[PDB]
């Protein structure tokens, strides 16, 4: 078991829509999704004090940043992105 009620969630990539096509289309692309995986606490929706450890605690949600940096192809200024994703939900002891 774990101190916090953390649940895996899959997020589908945003689907490009061919609204130009008034005709129906295969849902096969809708059928399979590569997706990404995240984590969140539903512990009272992430409110539990991590009960079975009695020390003064409250469950926190923790994030991670991915840094992809590439100098532009047109040799413009270097482009750096830091996408943030909810990665873990962890319990921390607190004062009084």
């Amino acid at each position: 078991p774990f101190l916090c009620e953390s649940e895996q969630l899959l997020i589908h990539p945003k689907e490009e829509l061919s609204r130009n096509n008034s005709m129906v289309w295969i849902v096969n692309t809708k059928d399979y999704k590569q997706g990404v995986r995240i984590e969140k606490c539903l512990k009272r929706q992430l409110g539990k004090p991590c009960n079975f450890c009695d020390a003064d605690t409250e469950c926190k949600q923790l994030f991670h940043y991915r840094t992809l940096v590439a100098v532009d192809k047109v040799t413009k200024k270097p482009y750096k992105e830091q996408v943030l994703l909810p990665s873990c939900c962890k319990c921390a002891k607190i004062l009084s």
Binding site: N21, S22, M23, V24, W25, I26
Partner: protein, 181 residues
């Protein structure tokens, strides 16, 4: 039942038919009408439209059709109207077993073959039928047809609408003996 959409951007549609496709029933629609083609139009197999919508509707109406060239090869058809067409007699292959509804309203029909009506014995799907407003031949050969009609009353929409060709009357009034004196 009305949410329609374009026919998969395919050119497979016949010329004057302005067909379409309907998801709800998975029925590729073909709406040849107003004498679009005097000959029966070619059947676009459901292999198109992502090979989906196995059932196929055909909506021929107000057409000069005189000879149903429908074949057992075309078992994708689910429905048929043929309303207001000049058809004297029908072939046994002309009606497919897979067909669920046929109407042929207000047509020229007057005859029948028991071989044609071999599928009066149940088909894969119920054949809900409503043929009417025609002049149908009247004799002991037609008396067996009347018996067929009487037995399968549920499959038919009405027995008042059918009329004896020389003298329009509801076919229920006749026992085969009356038509055989």
């Amino acid at each position: 039942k009305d949410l329609l959409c374009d026919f998969e951007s395919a050119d497979d549609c016949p010329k004057d038919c302005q067909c379409a496709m309907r998801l709800l029933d998975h029925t590729v629609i073909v709406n040849c009408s107003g004498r679009g083609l005097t000959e029966f139009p070619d059947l676009p197999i459901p292999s198109q439209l992502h090979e989906d919508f196995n059932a196929l509707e055909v909506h021929v109406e107000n057409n000069r059709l005189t000879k149903l060239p429908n074949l057992t090869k075309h078992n994708e058809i689910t429905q048929l109207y043929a309303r207001n067409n000049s058809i004297q007699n029908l072939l046994p292959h002309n009606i497919p077993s897979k067909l669920r509804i046929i109407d042929l309203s207000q047509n020229l029909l007057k005859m029948i073959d028991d071989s044609t009506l071999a599928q009066i014995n149940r088909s894969s799907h119920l054949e809900t039928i409503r043929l009417s407003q025609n002049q149908w031949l009247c004799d002991c050969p037609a008396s067996s047809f009347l018996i067929f009609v009487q037995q399968n009353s549920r499959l038919i929409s009405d027995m008042s609408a059918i009329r004896c060709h020389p003298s329009g009357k509801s076919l229920d009034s006749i026992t085969v003996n009356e038509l055989c004196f």
